[PDB]
Amino acid sequence: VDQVITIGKHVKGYHYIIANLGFTDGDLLKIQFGGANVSGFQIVDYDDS
Amino acid sequence: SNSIQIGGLFPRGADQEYSAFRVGMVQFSTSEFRLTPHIDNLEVANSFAVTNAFCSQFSRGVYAIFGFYDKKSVNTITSFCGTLHVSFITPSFPTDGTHPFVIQMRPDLKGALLSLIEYYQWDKFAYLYDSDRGLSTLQAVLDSAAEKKWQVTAINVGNINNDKKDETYRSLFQDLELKKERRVILDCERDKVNDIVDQVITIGKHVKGYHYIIANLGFTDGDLLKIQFGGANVSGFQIVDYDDSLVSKFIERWSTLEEKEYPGAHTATIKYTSALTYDAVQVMTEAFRNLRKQRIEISRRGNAGDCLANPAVPWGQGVEIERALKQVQVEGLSGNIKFDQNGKRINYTINIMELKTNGPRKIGYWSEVDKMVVTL
Amino acid sequence: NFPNNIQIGGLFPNQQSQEHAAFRFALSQLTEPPKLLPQIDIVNISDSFEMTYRFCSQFSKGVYAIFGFYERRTVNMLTSFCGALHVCFITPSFPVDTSNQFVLQLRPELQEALISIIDHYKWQTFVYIYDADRGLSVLQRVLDTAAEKNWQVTAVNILTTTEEGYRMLFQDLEKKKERLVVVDCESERLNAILGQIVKLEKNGIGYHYILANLGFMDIDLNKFKESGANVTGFQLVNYTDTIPARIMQQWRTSDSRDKRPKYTSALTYDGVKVMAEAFQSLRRQRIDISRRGNAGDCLANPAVPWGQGIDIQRALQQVRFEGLTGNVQFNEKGRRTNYTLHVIEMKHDGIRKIGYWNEDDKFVPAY
Numbered sequence: 001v002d003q004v005i006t007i008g009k010h011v012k013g014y015h016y017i018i019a020n021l022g023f024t025d026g027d028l029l030k031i032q033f034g035g036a037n038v039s040g041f042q043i044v045d046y047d048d049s
Numbered sequence: 050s051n052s053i054q055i056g057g058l059f060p061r062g063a064d065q066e067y068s069a070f071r072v073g074m075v076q077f078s079t080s081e082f083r084l085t086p087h088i089d090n091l092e093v094a095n096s097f098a099v100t101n102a103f104c105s106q107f108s109r110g111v112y113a114i115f116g117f118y119d120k121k122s123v124n125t126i127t128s129f130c131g132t133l134h135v136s137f138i139t140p141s142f143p144t145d146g147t148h149p150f151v152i153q154m155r156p157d158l159k160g161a162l163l164s165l166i167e168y169y170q171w172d173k174f175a176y177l178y179d180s181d182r183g184l185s186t187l188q189a190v191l192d193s194a195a196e197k198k199w200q201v202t203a204i205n206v207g208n209i210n211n212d213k214k215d216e217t218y219r220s221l222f223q224d225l226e227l228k229k230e231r232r233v234i235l236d237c238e239r240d241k242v243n244d245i246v247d248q249v250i251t252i253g254k255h256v257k258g259y260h261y262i263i264a265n266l267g268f269t270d271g272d273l274l275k276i277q278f279g280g281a282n283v284s285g286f287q288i289v290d291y292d293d294s295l296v297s298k299f300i301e302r303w304s305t306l307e308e309k310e311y312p313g314a315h316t317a318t319i320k321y322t323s324a325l326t327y328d329a330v331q332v333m334t335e336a337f338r339n340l341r342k343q344r345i346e347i348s349r350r351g352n353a354g355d356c357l358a359n360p361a362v363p364w365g366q367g368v369e370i371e372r373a374l375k376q377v378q379v380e381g382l383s384g385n386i387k388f389d390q391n392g393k394r395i396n397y398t399i400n401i402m403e404l405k406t407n408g409p410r411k412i413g414y415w416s417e418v419d420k421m422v423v424t425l
Numbered sequence: 426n427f428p429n430n431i432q433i434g435g436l437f438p439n440q441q442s443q444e445h446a447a448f449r450f451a452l453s454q455l456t457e458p459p460k461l462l463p464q465i466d467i468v469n470i471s472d473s474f475e476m477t478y479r480f481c482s483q484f485s486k487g488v489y490a491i492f493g494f495y496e497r498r499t500v501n502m503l504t505s506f507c508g509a510l511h512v513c514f515i516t517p518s519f520p521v522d523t524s525n526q527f528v529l530q531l532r533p534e535l536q537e538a539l540i541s542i543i544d545h546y547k548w549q550t551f552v553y554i555y556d557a558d559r560g561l562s563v564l565q566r567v568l569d570t571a572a573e574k575n576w577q578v579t580a581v582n583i584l585t586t587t588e589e590g591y592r593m594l595f596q597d598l599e600k601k602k603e604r605l606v607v608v609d610c611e612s613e614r615l616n617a618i619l620g621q622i623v624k625l626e627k628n629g630i631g632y633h634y635i636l637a638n639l640g641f642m643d644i645d646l647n648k649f650k651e652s653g654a655n656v657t658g659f660q661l662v663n664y665t666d667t668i669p670a671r672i673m674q675q676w677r678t679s680d681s682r683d684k685r686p687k688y689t690s691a692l693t694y695d696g697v698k699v700m701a702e703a704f705q706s707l708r709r710q711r712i713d714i715s716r717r718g719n720a721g722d723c724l725a726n727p728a729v730p731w732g733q734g735i736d737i738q739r740a741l742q743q744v745r746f747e748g749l750t751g752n753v754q755f756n757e758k759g760r761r762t763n764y765t766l767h768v769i770e771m772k773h774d775g776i777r778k779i780g781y782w783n784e785d786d787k788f789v790p791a792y
């Protein structure tokens with residue numbers, strides 16, 4: 001992710017699928033505003049009480 | 050034992066500049082005489098503080114003052130110096146007028162900038178200016194806009210409370226996401242430039258199709274590497290030519306100094322402000338050396354007195370000191386140094402730079418008389 | 426209770442002027458102790474040095490406040506010396522963007538009102554002629570708005586452009602049918618620019634002027650007799666209103682028994698009652714004031730403030746009354762608040778009242 005950003009490939013037109021079970025375990029904020037699609041998976045639902 | 054006393058008025062954070070000044074004192078010192086600096090550290094934007102420090106140095110009987118001013122304190126400096134015939138030597142922005150007794154180490158940037166804008170054949174562009182720093186060069190491009198046929202969108206970048214900052218700078222560019230602005234002039238201190246560069250990158254506007262002109266004299270003073278690979282054009286100006294042996298030989302030395310003894314000085318580059326400061330010590334040294342080579346005695350007999358003495362009768366030798374300072378012609382870190390009768394740099398050169406994937410490269414040079422020249 | 430005489434310093438740029446006569450008149454009206462005992466000095470209001478000298482001399486002599494005038498070249502020294510010493514400066518001069526609580530600005534701000542008037546006539550592209558002497562912060566405010574509403578403004582500093590510079594841009598303007606000009610500057614420089622404009626504009630057809638000034642009626646408007654020129658401005662004072670008229674009547678007789686007052690003279694008049702009110706509020710609050718006639722020195726490090734300065738400052742700021750300039754009132758930053766500006770228009774001596782402007786409602790008009 002750090003290198004995609006430095007290369008400028010986090011813009012609209014690219015789409016990344018993070019294939020692990022912890023989509024929000026890492027820092028997504030930094031790739032959030034480029035325009036790229038970023039999808040993943042999450043097993044820990046922080047909405048559960 | 051030949052001590053010529055001088056003052057040094059240093060802004061409260063100008064570490065590298067002071068290191069540069071201390072280095073020049075060593076480089077240029079001689080058996081002939083020793084410049085004996087008295088140093089004040091002060092809130093340079095505070096006119097009261099500036100008057101206090103000037104008057105304090107005047108009372109001591111300094112033979113000249115090296116120092117810095119702000120747009121808020123510049124009038125204090127020029128009025129007090131002009132009235133008392135005390136020469137001020139400074140790397141600060143050149144005064145807007147022909148004020149006497151002020152040796153302006155820093156060359157004018159307006160010509161080169163106007164020339165560069167024409168070069169790229171711009172007609173419509175955004176101009177980010179910093180009210181904190183001044184409007185003088187904005188005004189020059191606003192004056193020229195008609196004749197040169199430009200449409201300028203001027204945005205003030207100067208009252209940003211660091212609290213937000215991120216949010217402000219993003220709002221600004223997501224607003225230039227209205228008139229489809231892609232050509233942008235910066236005109237800021239190197240820090241504010243860095244901050245803005247940081248936000249341009251975060252917003253993803255450092256790609257192909259945008260072009261930025263950094264309107265200061267220190268293109269490579271800041272970190273360009275981070276905006277180098279986006280694809281955007283980035284152009285600027287440079288007065289310290291690291292290709293010169295004089296400069297290369299200086300940096301050889303500067304890169305070696307202990308950082309603990311010389312804050313800001315364990316590096317490969319050097320801020321153009323610090324380079325102008327080092328250069329200032331040479332000019333002051335030559336001027337006072339030349340006053341002796343002409344057996345012009347300039348030694349004060351009686352106390353300088355109180356800067357608030359009334360009437361104000363300037364000392365007789367002030368004019369001689371000014372002239373000697375303005376007659377100095379040497380080569381230094383900032384190239385050929387020469388002054389006109391109003392203490393403005395003349396016959397100087399400003400390098401024109403573009404950022405490339407392999408780093409900043411000189412693309413040409415700007416001269417007082419040749420204007421803009423593509424290098425090849 | 427308090428001292429019987431409250432010495433008041435003065436920083437005036439002239440030996441004689443309508444302001445001086447306004448100042449002296451307002452003072453002879455007062456009846457209640459403490460007596461305001463004026464002690465003024467004629468000084469170059471543009472010179473920080475002379476200004477520092479006078480300020481310190483008055484501070485040393487023991488004045489409780491200073492009434493006076495400043496210019497763009499002196500605002501920083503005053504704001505700074507006022508803030509450091511806690512002596513208030515009460516001034517009719519052109520209000521500044523950032524000053525402090527200790528500076529009391531009798532003159533209502535104009536910049537918001539002006540932007541309303543431009544927004545009203547839906548101007549898009551226009552010339553903005555200004556006083557480099559006071560209006561460096563206002564221009565930016567105009568440039569700011571221009572960015573938002575996408576105006577095409579043309580900035581022109583009075584101090585720096587020549588007769589031919591003027592010829593030239595009035596030559597640019599007359600290439601298009603309606604010529605829109607804003608002129609923001611003080612009265613004396615205003616009148617000098619008038620004669621230069623009228624001569625350049627010929628028949629005056631298609632020219633629309635907005636004069637950013639508070640004394641529309643103070644201007645020589647004869648220079649516009651049979652000019653097609655559409656002239657809009659601002660009047661702070663109505664001399665036919667009850668309180669104003671009663672006041673005009675009082676000194677009109679004062680000078681006959683023994684000329685129409687300009688707005689700066691009106692502000693000077695109200696500036697005196699502000700001070701009178703301030704100290705009489707201190708008498709009924711029963712706060713005890715007193716100062717050294719023993720030349721307490723000015724310059725020091727740090728600046729040692731007058732311990733009771735904050736008392737005089739709170740009093741000056743809380744003042745509320747009806748004077749020659751309408752409702753006289755200050756916000757906490759030291760500026761006029763709760764005021765109404767009347768908007769006026771003129772063509773072939775068309776003296777019509779477009780309406781009024783205030784902080785809450787902005788601008789409301791009134792085959």
Ligand SMILES: *[C@@H]1O[C@H](CO)[C@@H](O[C@@H]2O[C@H](CO)[C@@H](O[C@@H]3O[C@H](CO)[C@@H](O)[C@H](O)[C@@H]3O)[C@H](O)[C@H]2NC(C)=O)[C@H](O)[C@H]1NC(C)=O
Pocket residue numbers: 124128146147469470471472473498
């Ligand atoms: C009152 O004090 C101020 C100093 O604070 C004096 O201001 C100085 O005024 C002179 C005369 O207006 C200015 O000089 C003029 O400058 C123009 C533009 O460069 C030049 O073309 C003229 O030849 C003339 O030199 C001077 O620049 C200004 N100084 C500063 C720091 O602004 C003022 O003159 C004093 N007036 C009186 C009546 O004592």
Ligand SMILES: *[C@@H]1O[C@H](CO)[C@@H](O[C@@H]2O[C@H](CO)[C@@H](O)[C@H](O)[C@H]2NC(C)=O)[C@H](O)[C@H]1NC(C)=O
Pocket residue numbers: 012013014015037
């Ligand atoms: C990013 O996400 C969108 C939505 O899933 C992708 O498709 C968009 O929506 C429709 C559905 O096919 C397309 O017709 C649009 O053209 C897409 N929107 C845009 C503006 O591209 C889109 O293709 C994804 N990006 C990539 C590279 O996969």
Ligand SMILES: *[C@@H]1O[C@H](CO)[C@@H](O[C@@H]2O[C@H](CO)[C@@H](O)[C@H](O)[C@H]2NC(C)=O)[C@H](O)[C@H]1NC(C)=O
Pocket residue numbers: 231232257258259260282
């Ligand atoms: C970035 O720099 C280039 C070169 O100065 C600008 O112009 C390019 O070169 C020619 C000369 O006009 C144009 O015909 C090309 O279309 C430009 N190259 C490309 C790929 O754009 C270019 O316009 C500059 N970018 C901006 C936004 O000013």
Ligand SMILES: *[C@@H]1O[C@H](CO)[C@@H](O[C@@H]2O[C@H](CO)[C@@H](O)[C@H](O)[C@H]2NC(C)=O)[C@H](O)[C@H]1NC(C)=O
Pocket residue numbers: 545546547633655656770771772775
């Ligand atoms: C002064 O000039 C202005 C400029 O247009 C005139 O104000 C307009 O009045 C017309 C006619 O009622 C209205 O339709 C517009 O709302 C106004 N326009 C603008 C641009 O402000 C005004 O009529 C002129 N005064 C005189 C006496 O002729």
Ligand SMILES: *[C@@H]1O[C@H](CO)[C@@H](O[C@@H]2O[C@H](CO)[C@@H](O)[C@H](O)[C@H]2NC(C)=O)[C@H](O)[C@H]1NC(C)=O
Pocket residue numbers: 752763
């Ligand atoms: C705005 O200023 C006006 C002064 O005109 C204030 O209105 C007066 O308020 C007093 C005090 O209660 C009343 O006795 C008067 O009848 C009012 N006069 C007029 C002419 O309206 C008003 O209170 C001020 N508003 C604010 C928010 O300070």
Ligand SMILES: *[C@@H]1O[C@H](CO)[C@@H](O)[C@H](O)[C@H]1NC(C)=O
Pocket residue numbers: 660661662663664665666767768769778
């Ligand atoms: C002052 O009041 C008179 C009252 O009739 C009114 O005509 C005039 O419009 C008012 N003031 C101004 C500034 O126009």
